[PDB]
Design a protein around this ligand. Structure first.
Ligand SMILES: [Ca+2]
Ligand SMILES: [Ca+2]
Length: 684
């Protein structure tokens, strides 16, 4: 199938995700609405259920609302059965409308519909090329007071009808009982209750196994992408393991939510995105967008920097999901913020790198500062807004022009209020000029692009005051960029040499199937490369110009670079493909008597890639924790590592470049062939 097809569950770079709070869109079925004080017909009260369900989405899918808007994927709230109880938080009754307070991940939220309904939604969506992405928060259950069982549903977790256990009298240790996260450390956040949310203990095998089984179900059903919530509050090791489990079943595009409140880098966030096997929601791109266009707190340079700084940190910057607003913040539009700016931030998002998402209601210029005001009911389904217009023109570009989909970004012109940047992938190009100034226009002179000689038209038709240019070998001729103007000029052509635009997913073990997207691969099956290893014949499950489905060859676990060769002509390399050793399990390492100096730390490293193949580098595990689950001088760390394999490992303290290893013999362990396990040792 072409890389653009809805069939491509491994890549959403060519897509436009429409993020929707199911309950707040369209109540297609009233029969499934909550009874009593959990329900609000007018939806005037947002802490309540308004009625929204899957039929309603089915509906807007059939009358082409989404197809006229050009969004190629729907991101809906978590489908799993939530707590039925109502919770008043000091005078105010709250409901699980958001879908965050789960109790059973193997049943569907009846207020959203049935299993048939869901399967009925998955069908209608693919029928029209709309992918379905869902939320899945494996971090916790519902709010739970341990002293008090009469509060909510005491976080009780079921398993397709059968109850596993609640927060109180949790003899087996499913949840964590460390109190709440005061948010001072990464550890404090991971291992402790988020607010009052019942924290799971993924080290517990039944919980480990449960989630593997649960996601497997939803994937088996048709989901194309999964959005993991609260990833900053669950161990990386456990998630990376959860991931390898998913990629072994039906590899789908997964991303997570690690909150950042600025365009500024955060190692932890970078690291995560890079070592977890999943991507993130580009909160730095979002901030950049907003200071510039919404808040007027930064200028175009700040935007250009964020563009570059992010490309350096993230390994696959194209997988980071972008946005202008979302359920975690004030609606972009406000009385002080004007439309052209909203439309400008859209145009920017829609044409920039990564996977873009649009919070439902944006096209309608919905406003609503804070929670749940940023979760207001869907106000209209008109296709007349200027916002609506801009999306329909700019979104299909992601499917038609691969410079948008997989291309690099480089600035041709810039100044405080003006920005002209260029996307390019192979021979294809796209140029976007932006002028945020609402009162003055700009005389752009000397602009150079890589647009072949021609007379170039504004893809937007001047809706956003775009003009027409003329290129003379890159050389664009002196032109005015009107006030609040924005124009998009592109250039597509056929690719002749193979050129990789994507590899999906980018981590797995030998035996898995990965998707290579690009252009020019040709039709006659060629050969793939994982480093120096040539994959050929029946290993290449599929082959065609824009996509190749290949099998991860049985090579040595490590970081590799994928190269493809269509007619002897090798393409470029998609660096950083992580090849595992095989199936993963999660092992909690505990070392005692590890006394560090001020500013010193402990890392893990062993004889397998998962542990860094004896390195003290970035590839080593750590720094280890020492506060919640175990305290200093006892350190601990959960790590994803090959199952049923004899491991050798040794701890080491680093404090400068100066490393200090454990003495004596390497510690050994034979990992479980499945699930999770603990392994305690003493600092030698
Ligand atoms: Ca309903
Ligand atoms: Ca947690």
């Amino acid at each position: 199938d072409p890389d653009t097809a809805v069939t491509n569950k491994q890549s959403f770079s060519t897509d436009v995700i429409y993020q929707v709070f199911t309950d707040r869109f369209l109540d297609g079925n009233p029969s499934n609405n909550p009874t009593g004080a959990a329900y609000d017909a007018t939806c005037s009260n947002l802490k309540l259920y308004c009625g929204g369900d899957w039929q309603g989405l089915i509906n807007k899918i059939n009358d082409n609302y989404f197809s006229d808007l050009g969004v190629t994927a729907l991101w809906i709230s978590q489908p799993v059965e939530n707590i039925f109880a109502t919770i008043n938080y000091s005078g105010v009754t709250n409901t699980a409308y958001h879908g965050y307070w789960a109790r059973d991940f193997k049943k569907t939220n009846p207020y959203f519909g049935t299993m048939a309904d869901f399967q009925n939604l998955i069908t209608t969506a693919h029928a029209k090329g709309i992918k379905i992405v869902i939320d899945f928060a494996p971090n916790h259950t519902s709010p739970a007071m341990e002293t008090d069982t009469s509060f909510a549903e005491n976080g009780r977790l079921y398993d397709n009808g059968t109850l596993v256990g609640g927060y109180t009298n949790d003899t087996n240790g499913y949840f964590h009982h460390n109190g709440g996260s005061d948010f001072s450390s990464l550890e404090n956040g991971i291992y402790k209750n988020l607010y009052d949310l019942a924290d799971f203990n993924h080290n517990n095998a039944t919980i480990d196994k449960y989630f593997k089984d649960a996601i497997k179900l939803w994937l088996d059903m048709g989901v194309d992408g999964i959005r993991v919530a609260a990833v900053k509050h669950m161990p990386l090791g456990w998630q990376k393991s959860w991931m390898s489990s998913i990629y072994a079943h039906k590899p789908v595009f997964t991303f997570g939510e690690w909150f950042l409140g600025s365009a500024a880098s955060d190692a932890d966030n970078t690291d995560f995105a890079n070592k977890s096997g999943m991507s993130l929601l580009d909160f730095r791109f979002n901030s950049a967008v907003r200071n510039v266009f919404r808040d007027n707190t930064s200028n175009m340079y700040a935007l250009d920097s964020m563009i570059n700084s992010t490309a350096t940190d993230y390994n696959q910057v194209n997988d980071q999901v972008t946005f202008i607003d979302n359920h975690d913040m004030d609606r972009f539009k406000t009385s002080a913020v004007n439309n052209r700016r909203l439309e400008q931030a859209l145009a920017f998002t829609l044409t920039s790198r990564g996977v873009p998402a649009i919070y439902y209601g944006t096209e309608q210029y919905l406003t609503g500062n804070g929670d749940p005001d940023n979760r207001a009911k869907m106000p209209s389904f008109s296709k007349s807004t200027t916002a609506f217009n801009v999306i329909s023109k700019l979104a299909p570009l992601r499917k038609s022009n691969p410079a948008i989909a997989y291309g690099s970004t480089q600035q041709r012109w810039i100044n405080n209020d003006v920005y002209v940047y260029e996307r390019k992938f192979g021979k294809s190009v796209a140029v976007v000029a932006v002028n945020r100034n609402l009162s003055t226009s700009a005389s752009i002179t000397g602009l150079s692009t890589s647009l072949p000689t021609g007379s170039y038209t504004d893809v937007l038709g001047g809706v956003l005051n775009g003009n027409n240019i003329t290129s003379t070998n890159g050389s664009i001729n002196n032109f005015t960029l009107a006030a609040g103007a924005t124009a998009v000029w592109q250039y597509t052509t056929a690719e002749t040499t193979p050129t990789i635009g994507h590899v999906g997913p980018v981590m797995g073990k030998p035996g898995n199937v990965v998707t290579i997207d690009g252009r020019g691969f040709g039709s006659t099956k060629g050969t793939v490369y994982f480093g120096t290893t040539a994959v050929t014949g029946a290993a290449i499950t599929s082959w065609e110009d824009t996509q190749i489905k290949v099998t991860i060859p049985s090579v040595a676990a490590g970081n590799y670079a994928v190269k493809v060769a269509a007619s002897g002509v090798n393409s470029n390399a998609y660096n950083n493909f992580t090849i595992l050793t095989g199936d993963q399990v999660t092992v909690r390492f505990v070392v005692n008597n590890a006394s560090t100096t001020l500013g010193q730390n402990l890392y893990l490293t062993g004889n397998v890639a998962e542990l860094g193949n004896w390195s003290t580098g970035s590839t080593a595990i750590g720094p280890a924790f020492n506060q919640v689950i175990h305290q200093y001088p006892t350190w601990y760390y959960d790590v994803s590592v090959p199952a049923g394999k004899q491991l050798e490992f040794k701890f080491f303290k680093k404090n400068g470049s100066t490393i200090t290893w454990e003495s004596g013999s390497n510690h050994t362990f034979t990992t479980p062939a499945s699930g999770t396990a603990t392994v305690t040792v003493n600092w030698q």
